[PDB]
Amino acid sequence: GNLAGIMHRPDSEMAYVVNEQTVNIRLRTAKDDIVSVELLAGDPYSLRSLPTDEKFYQVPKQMTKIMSDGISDFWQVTVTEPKRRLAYAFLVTDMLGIQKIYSDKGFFKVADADLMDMNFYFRMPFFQTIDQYNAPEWVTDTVWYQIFPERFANGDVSNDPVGTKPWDSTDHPGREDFYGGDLQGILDHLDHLQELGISGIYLNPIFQAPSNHKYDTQDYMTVDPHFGDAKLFKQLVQAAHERGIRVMLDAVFNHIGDKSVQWQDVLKNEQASPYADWFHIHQFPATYTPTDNFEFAADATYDTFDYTPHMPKLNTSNPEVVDYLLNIATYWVKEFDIDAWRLNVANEIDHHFWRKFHDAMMALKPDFYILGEIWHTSQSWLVGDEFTAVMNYSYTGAILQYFLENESADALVQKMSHQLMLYRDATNRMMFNTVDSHDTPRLMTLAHEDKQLAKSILTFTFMQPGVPSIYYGTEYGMTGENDPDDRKPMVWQPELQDHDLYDFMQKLVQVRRQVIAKLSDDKIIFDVIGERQIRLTREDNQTRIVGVFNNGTTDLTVAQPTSILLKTNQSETQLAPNDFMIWTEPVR
Amino acid sequence: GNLAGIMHRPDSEMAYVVNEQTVNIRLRTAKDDIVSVELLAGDPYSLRSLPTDEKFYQVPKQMTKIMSDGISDFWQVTVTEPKRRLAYAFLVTDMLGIQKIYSDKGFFKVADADLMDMNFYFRMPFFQTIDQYNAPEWVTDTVWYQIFPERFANGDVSNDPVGTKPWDSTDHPGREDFYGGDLQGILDHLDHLQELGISGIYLNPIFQAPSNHKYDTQDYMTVDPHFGDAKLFKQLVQAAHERGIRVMLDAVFNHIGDKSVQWQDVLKNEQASPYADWFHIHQFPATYTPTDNFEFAADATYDTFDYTPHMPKLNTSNPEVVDYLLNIATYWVKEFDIDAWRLNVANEIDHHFWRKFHDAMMALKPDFYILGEIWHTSQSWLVGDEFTAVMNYSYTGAILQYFLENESADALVQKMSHQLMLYRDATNRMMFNTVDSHDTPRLMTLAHEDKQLAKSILTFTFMQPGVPSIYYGTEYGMTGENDPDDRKPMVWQPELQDHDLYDFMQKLVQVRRQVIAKLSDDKIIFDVIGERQIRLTREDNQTRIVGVFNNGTTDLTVAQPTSILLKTNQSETQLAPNDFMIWTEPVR
Numbered sequence A, B: 001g002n003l004a005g006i007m008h009r010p011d012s013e014m015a016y017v018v019n020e021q022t023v024n025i026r027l028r029t030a031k032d033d034i035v036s037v038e039l040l041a042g043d044p045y046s047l048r049s050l051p052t053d054e055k056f057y058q059v060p061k062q063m064t065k066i067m068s069d070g071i072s073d074f075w076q077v078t079v080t081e082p083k084r085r086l087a088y089a090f091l092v093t094d095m096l097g098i099q100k101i102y103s104d105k106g107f108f109k110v111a112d113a114d115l116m117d118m119n120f121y122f123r124m125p126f127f128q129t130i131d132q133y134n135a136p137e138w139v140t141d142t143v144w145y146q147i148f149p150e151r152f153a154n155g156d157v158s159n160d161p162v163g164t165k166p167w168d169s170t171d172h173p174g175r176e177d178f179y180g181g182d183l184q185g186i187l188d189h190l191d192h193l194q195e196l197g198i199s200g201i202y203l204n205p206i207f208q209a210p211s212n213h214k215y216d217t218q219d220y221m222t223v224d225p226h227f228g229d230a231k232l233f234k235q236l237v238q239a240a241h242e243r244g245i246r247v248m249l250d251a252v253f254n255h256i257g258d259k260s261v262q263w264q265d266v267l268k269n270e271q272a273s274p275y276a277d278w279f280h281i282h283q284f285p286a287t288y289t290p291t292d293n294f295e296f297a298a299d300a301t302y303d304t305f306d307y308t309p310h311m312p313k314l315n316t317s318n319p320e321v322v323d324y325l326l327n328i329a330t331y332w333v334k335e336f337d338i339d340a341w342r343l344n345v346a347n348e349i350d351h352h353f354w355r356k357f358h359d360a361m362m363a364l365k366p367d368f369y370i371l372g373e374i375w376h377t378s379q380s381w382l383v384g385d386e387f388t389a390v391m392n393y394s395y396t397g398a399i400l401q402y403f404l405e406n407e408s409a410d411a412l413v414q415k416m417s418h419q420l421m422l423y424r425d426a427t428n429r430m431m432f433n434t435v436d437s438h439d440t441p442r443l444m445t446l447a448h449e450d451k452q453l454a455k456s457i458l459t460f461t462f463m464q465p466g467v468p469s470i471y472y473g474t475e476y477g478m479t480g481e482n483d484p485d486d487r488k489p490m491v492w493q494p495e496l497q498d499h500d501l502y503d504f505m506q507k508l509v510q511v512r513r514q515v516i517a518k519l520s521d522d523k524i525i526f527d528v529i530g531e532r533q534i535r536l537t538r539e540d541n542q543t544r545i546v547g548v549f550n551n552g553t554t555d556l557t558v559a560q561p562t563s564i565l566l567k568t569n570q571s572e573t574q575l576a577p578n579d580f581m582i583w584t585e586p587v588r
């Protein structure tokens, strides 16, 4: 009995409200150390207040071992209680047959447990739906497409910045290059987006900013003049909505650009500036020593994003900053009807501000989607009062490491199970899955131009619980290393486009939207069936979707499925190295 | 290497902000499984952005094993970072000499760790003081006195309820008895309170309510007429403040009494009532089947506290209820200058309301003290955005179980260490310690009238990090079983008072306020020196307070201290069973 490996944290992802009378409860144990876990649960007041001789601890509820991360096992159970008050404890039995009760009071023999004392148990005191996590349903049926607007399509040469280069997808872009992409180009290629089958557009920042990336905001209340104007953006949003495509914008609230009005005021008036307290200035005047790298300063007298002097950090604890940012976030939603906000460097802004932001957005749109850009563990931002989800960088990163390196299938399945057990079930369905972006090398480059490997990575990711996204140009096999090489002008020429990959992407998106998205309360199972061989199963009460991935150096034979949805090998039974097959079957 | 017993939860009690540039970080391991833990910590951006060859992971920080609960060991370290951004990982070495790195990515050999990737580490993204827990300093120097107003002192026979019984401390009170205690009696005995040395008064509810306990509120905006009026309560608060005594009131917001205006409106107008949505009514009309027990109904059509039909539960998610309760809480503080709120059944009210309540109170008084009445684990209410502390029922309950039963000293020390490791350090100093109350048997009754045992329990509790409280009459040795027997009229007669215990209580309070309260950032150590023998040490840089408690069946000899503060045996070296000795010594 590895008692040190057993843990339950109440009022957490291990004990949360699903609906008015229902809760989900989890227990962590040491891997393969516990053979069974039962839950003793009921109304805490029923023990001594009800005249009945029956007590809730006399009818245990069996828990199911749902996941394992190589170190711990994870058990779960769902409990319904009409009184909406729950006290609970765990009955754990290990390999040697040693059984103990685990409660808020610790570990006991069942004979020594004070089961009649309501304060012996862990507690969910009252099922508070106002405190619970809620997931917007529409996100479940979405496949996103990420657009870096400067490089997607130039629909208007008239607004091009000075020195705009000729549109060349084969170019290796420089850090300060401009190609002239704008909102009119996105409006022009909405038909390509709809033919691909995507139902959501994620835009990198489009607010006035001097750079090609626009993360150094100059004015949050105005669309960049090179990109277009307010009327054109409203037209774009309405056309997207007409095509059944939702819109998500990028909010850069952790820092502002140095060319912004507030910062220039700070540079002119120093401490006498009204915006001095909008920033984190250690010493006046706000200064820094320039270096050869434009994005690096070693001795700035003010806090900044990374070590770049051009992005002074905003003081989100200042009430004036709070009001300003909330007004911006409310303005874009209320005036242009956007569907989601993507929060840049969301982890470096305080929870207090995010709580206010969540309240404002939900007061505007109850089904709003708040996505946080965080690379590490975000349990504190996904309780239900702040973000809906975060970018699932660790999940897709583990997937990429498995497919590109020679790691065992067990390692990948353990990493994915750890990730899933970090959060609530619905939160897991809201996580944002992308294999590359404007900050990482392109998938085709990562796969060393191995198309089959890229198809396998994309299919494996699209089968995951989170919502998938396609970085612009992935559907045509665009290559590139890290930024700025991952921001090449979009390949609009047919001679340079991979049409086979585009056809495959259309089929993959169709499988995601017509099959995996229509599963009802599906369960996910990871099975390691051999060295670098994985069987993924998503299963609801009526239908089951199975995908087998052969990433070994040998052929793999499977029983012939009756209805194959997607496969790369011509055979219906044999899988060569890097092949995969997806099929569907009724539950029996 | 028991890897399953090792856990760090970021942005928790295991990783929190102490001040603008300082954080505390904890690690849990399996007991006696890990021989050492180092912390690798630094600015996450410094790894690849600074041109230096020096990296923060090359200079580890040693962690100290601070606590152990019999199952796990708890290590802690304090880290200062001028950039106010922290990435960190743990270097753990077990009994066999196996060393591994533990990060947000899992467990690795140091050779296989991607130490140059900032996303490999756990993260405190930016030190947010607006999100941090703050403890009001004055609480550290307080010793509370809890008054059940109906039974403390009758200062006015004119306001006595009908059928008020003659004041008799030897009576066994009935559930619906009245003795006539009021606010004028508290005003009359403030001198007794000041002579005892207490600096805080905790009052049970004084708002208009029909019962002797007043937890079935009729009107929150008015002092009960039997108790007094607004002018008398203002006089009481100002006299207490004049004597250096703070005032804490009892807020019963989870439920309202059935004689209240809102409930009577619901009983008259049913669903047409404007207050229908202020409650949790499952079926109209709101009804129940009466039983022989006035406080029990098996089939009420509305949610209530416990199973009593007279306390319908308030719907704290309704904005009108939120506004009403916030107005009440603001009114008593702003108009009468009370110093603290004690929140009745605080766990059954949602976090959203408590966040609003905290914000309102702190906007009124930055040093306000919010105490939650919760019997189980309250990690979710003590993050710093809701309560300051909770009633420390589990801690004092473990102490009582040790002193009254024959449990080993190891068990008590493990329970106390588990409790301390559940929360932040400052939170531990804010917890409210009382050995009995109006809901539990009196200490003298629990000790079977063994005065020495009661003195030992009280001294041991007063040496703990939390703030101590004295239930009225404890200083005179009042007896009684559970409520209503624990609510006997206060013993004002000298022939029935234990003067020896009163003298001892004065000395104990003086030791707490003049010595233990003046320790600066003191450290607490539990040492088991023998079967049922405990050495408690509180130690700052300059002074150290030691207390030895002999709870065995044999004599214990100690070296003669130079400055004894408190002892029960006449010898300065020998401790007989149930004896204890407290002394002080300089740190060397």
Ligand SMILES: OC[C@H]1O[C@H](O[C@H]2[C@H](O)[C@@H](O)[C@@H](O)O[C@@H]2CO)[C@H](O)[C@@H](O)[C@@H]1O
Pocket (backbone or CB within 6 Å): A213, A215, A252, A295, A305, A308, A344, A345, A373, A438, A439, A483
């Ligand atoms: O000038 C620094 C940096 O700014 C942008 O980087 C973004 C990044 O793209 C976002 O995903 C997030 O991590 O915040 C960063 C700062 O806002 C540019 O994209 C990048 O090229 C540039 O170096």
Ligand SMILES: OC[C@H]1O[C@H](O[C@H]2[C@H](O)[C@@H](O)[C@@H](O)O[C@@H]2CO)[C@H](O)[C@@H](O)[C@@H]1O
Pocket (backbone or CB within 6 Å): B213, B215, B252, B295, B305, B308, B344, B345, B373, B438, B439, B483
């Ligand atoms: O009528 C039920 C009950 O009401 C009060 O109990 C309080 C208790 O004293 C508080 O500490 C807290 O737990 O909430 C309870 C309900 O407000 C009376 O004190 C008790 O005698 C009575 O039975």
Ligand SMILES: [Ca+2]
Pocket (backbone or CB within 6 Å): A154, A155, A156, A157, A158, A159, A160, A180, A181, A182, A226
């Ligand atoms: Ca253009």
Ligand SMILES: [Ca+2]
Pocket (backbone or CB within 6 Å): B154, B155, B156, B157, B158, B159, B160, B180, B181, B182, B226
């Ligand atoms: Ca009276």
